[PDB]
Amino acid sequence: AVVSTDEYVARTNIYYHAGTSRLLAVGHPYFPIKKPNNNKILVPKVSGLQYRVFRIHLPDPNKFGFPDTSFYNPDTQRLVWACVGVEVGRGQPLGVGISGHPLLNKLDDTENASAYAANAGVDNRECISMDYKQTQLCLIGCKPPIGEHWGKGSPCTQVAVQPGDCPPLELINTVIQDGDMVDTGFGAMDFTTLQANKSEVPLDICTSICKYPDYIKMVSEPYGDSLFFYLRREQMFVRHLFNRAGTVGENVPDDLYIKGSGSTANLASSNYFPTPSGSMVTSDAQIFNKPYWLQRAQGHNNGICWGNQLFVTVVDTTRSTNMSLCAAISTSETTYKNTNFKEYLRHGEEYDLQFIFQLCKITLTADVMTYIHSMNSTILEDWNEDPLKKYTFWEVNLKEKFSADLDQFPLGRKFLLQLGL
């Protein structure tokens, strides 16, 4: 049976504040800029539509050097940091980005037509952009976040997949890594392996995987380490209604309509797809720049940072403004020439993480050691190499950032005022 950490984890009266200076990220909104002949990344892809997964490293409270150490017995017990307050600071002005594709698979406008559309020739793709669905979310736990997305399932060993045959779907659980893309209105799926077309969606998700947090699975999790607190806010509406060029993968059963004739003789593509639009962004609706007090967790792990680790996943598309900056090739002629200016695109993201940690002690009794051992053997082994080296996240080191004077920091003042004593 699993039990609340309040059972075996003791709460001391010591509290420390810790915070990143001010994280900054600048890059291209749709794709990374690199050397053609090479593969080294010159400029990274930085978009408001990516997940930001912070791997927070905390100083081992056992190796730490406290002024006083009488508050516990280093023989019978051990120390763990407990996250009690978080403030995800965001810093650019609110605004909305925009993404498109120079060759988006968009046949005709199906929202309203005055006459039957022409006939699909060869490549009817259009240069089209859209404003993705708005999403604000924040996940916190001591394990990395887990997402879900549809990918190409493995086929059954029977009917040889005829080329062009529709690929099988399969919900795939994955670890959400820093830089991954968020569903933008086309759902959470792997567009690379599910759209040979390479033109169904804008460039920035075009050959990526849009993942959605698997909130159900994470909360079902027995120990609840992956996430002990979260805030989600997503909205979207249909801006345009389009058609997809290409060839009928699956024909429309003729029991659903009466055959046409002349122009209506041939059925137009009924493979419709809408254009998303996350409406207006607003201050009143902000999730960030507000402190979160993680006092009572819904899971059994009440904010204990086992492994002196801490994960903070964020997605904020309310500051997705991309800025175009163009340089002149020549500063002479007083006559505009499109050829005289090189146009570019850049997007900047500004973060500032702040936390309030509470020191905790665990008397290592038999039962306790059996439990903690079953839960996660590494806990004890590490007490008196990186298991997720495969995955990548924004590494954040706070070992030198802890301070006992909450007084001296904004999140700290807030905390004292909130908790009174």
Rg for the chain, CA atoms, rounded: 26
Q: How many Cβ atoms are within 10 Å of 17's Cβ, its own excluded? A: 23
Q: By CB under 8 A, name the one of 6, 7, 33, 373 that touches its own copies.
A: 33
- Binding status of residue 414 toward its own copies by CB under 8 A: yes
Q: By CB under 8 A, name the one of 10, 14, 103, 375 that touches its own copies.
A: 103
Nearer to its own copies, 79 or 142 (CB): 142
Q: Would you mind telling me the total number of residues written for the chain in this entry? A: 421
At closest approach, how far in Å is the CB of 82 from its own copies? 19
- Binding status of residue 173 toward its own copies by CB under 8 A: no
* Subset of residues 105 to 144 that bind its own copies, contact rule: CB under 8 A: 105-106, 108-117, 120-131, 133
Q: How many Cβ atoms are within 10 Å of 154's Cβ, its own excluded? A: 7
Q: By CB under 8 A, name the one of 17, 28, 52, 78 that touches its own copies.
A: 28
Phi-psi region of 349 (alpha: psi -120 to 50; beta: other; left: phi over 0): beta
Residue partners of 96: CB distance under 8 A and separation at least 6: 131, 134, 278, 281, 317, 318, 320, 321
* Subset of residues 53 to 92 that bind its own copies, contact rule: CB under 8 A: 89, 91-92
Query: Cα 317 from chain centroid?
Result: 10
At closest approach, how far in Å is the CB of 380 from its own copies? 23
Is-contact 38 378, C-beta < 8 A?
no
Nearer to its own copies, 278 or 307 (CB): 278
Nearer to its own copies, 178 or 349 (CB): 349
* Subset of residues 265 to 324 that bind its own copies, contact rule: CB under 8 A: 267-274, 276-277, 279-284, 289, 298-299, 321-324
Is-contact 286 316, C-beta < 8 A?
no
Q: Which of 353, 332, 367, 311 is nearest to 55 (CA)?
A: 311
198 vs 55: CA distance, rounded Å: 33
Nearer to its own copies, 68 or 333 (CB): 333
At closest approach, how far in Å is the CB of 66 from its own copies? 19
At closest approach, how far in Å is the CB of 147 from its own copies? 10
Nearer to its own copies, 319 or 361 (CB): 319
The type of residue at 64 is F
Number of residues that bind its own copies (CB under 8 A): 166
Per CB under 8 A, the segment of 57-65, 68-76, 78-86, 195-203 that binds its own copies is 195-203
Q: By CB under 8 A, name the one of 156, 160, 216, 366 that touches its own copies.
A: 216
Q: What would the two tokens of residue 67 be?
A: 């002024």
Per CB under 8 A, the segment of 47-55, 193-201, 367-375, 377-385 that binds its own copies is 193-201
At closest approach, how far in Å is the CB of 79 from its own copies? 26
DSSP string, 314-382: EEE-TB---EEEEEES-S--SS--GGGEEEEEEEEEEEEEEEEEEEEEEE--HHHHHHHHHHHTHHHHH
